[PDB]
Structure formats: C-alpha cells, structure tokens
Amino acid sequence: GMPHAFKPGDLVFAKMKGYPHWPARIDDIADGAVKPPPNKYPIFFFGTHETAFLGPKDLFPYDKSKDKYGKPNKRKGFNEGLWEIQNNPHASYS
C-alpha cells in the first residue's frame, strides 16, 4: 500500500477526553505486541508512561499546532512533556 499518514517518530499533539491537547509521538509496536485497531496508531504521551491507541481525529501534527497547543500548563507531566518534545523527541521513553 501507500505510506500511512502517520509513521513512527512523527510528532503530534494528541487529544483524549478530559485532557488538553498533549505533546506526543507515534511509537513503534514492540515485537509481538498488540496492534492497534484499523486506522489507529500507538501514541506515546511525553511526560507520562501512557501509550494509547488513537485515530487521526485526535492527532494534530506538531508543526501546524504548536503555536496554539505548545503552551505551558500545570497538568501533571505536561510541562515535562513539552520539554521532551522540544528538546529530545526521539529518545527512549517508557
């Protein structure tokens, strides 16, 4: 097939119910691990230990959205996650 819209390493803000748009990346599925439902992706939330499966309606490509969503807030882990996406977005995190 053609390349998917999102691929491992892509940076986003990801939206979950109850939470502000959160700095995140598309992760690899580990060898042998559960794969997402169709047209979903494993999303690693910077500043957290959360990986969740989300679809595109909840994914805001980082460059388009950073001016609006890339602003400090005091949710736990948020500003740490902003630091990570800005300063070391491709490091090992878990």
DSSP string covering the chain, please?
A: -PPPSS-TT-EEEE--TTS--EEEEEPPPPTTPPPPPTT-EEEEETTSS-EEEE-GGGEEEHHHHHHHH-S---STTHHHHHHHHHH-TTS---
Domains and CATH numbers, the chain: 11-87 (2.30.30.140)
Cα end-to-end span (Å), the chain? 30
Give the Cα separation of 45 and 94 in Å (integer). 9
> In whole angstroms, how large is the CA radius of gyration of the chain?
13
Give the Cα separation of 75 and 41 in Å (integer). 24
Q: Which residue has the tokens 């892509």?
A: 10
Give the Cα separation of 6 and 27 in Å (integer). 10
Q: Which method was it determined by?
A: X-ray
Q: Give kind and range of the element (H or E) at residue 11.
A: strand 11-14
Structure tokens, 88: 């070391």
